[PDB]
């Protein structure tokens, strides 16, 4: 079975000091991978060349665990006032050559922080 993984968007945190997104992400299955690629979007399918790119990360070995959160940080590359203009917000998950993509991560309900 496809590896995927859900999000409880309210718990996505924008620092605004530290210009940093925090994704907690559960996965359906354990999987461990060697390199990990996360890119936060407004508009990609995940193939080719990233585009709409909000932010991204590179991982190596990687331990997800069925069910249990794993937290993904991003740098931000769009302030937030932006990122709640997109109509939808993707994170796609790359890992070891396959991907996965947890759909409309609603950037309305996350919480922002820093003064």
């Given at each position: 079975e496809n590896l995927s993984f859900t999000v409880k968007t309210d718990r996505i945190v924008y620092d605004m000091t530290q210009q940093v997104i925090t994704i907690p992400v559960k996965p359906n299955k354990s999987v461990n991978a060697s390199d990990v690629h996360a890119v936060l979007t407004y508009?990609?399918?995940?193939?080719g060349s990233s585009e709409k790119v909000i932010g991204e990360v590179y991982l190596k070995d990687v331990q997800w665990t069925a069910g249990i959160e794993y937290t993904i940080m991003i740098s931000a590359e769009l302030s937030i006032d932006e990122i709640k203009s997109k109509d939808k917000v993707d994170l796609i998950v790359f890992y070891d050559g396959q991907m996965t993509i947890t759909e409309?991560?609603?950037?309305?309900?996350w919480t922002v922080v820093g003064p």
């Open positions: 508009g990609w399918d995940g193939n409309n991560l609603k950037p309305s309900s």
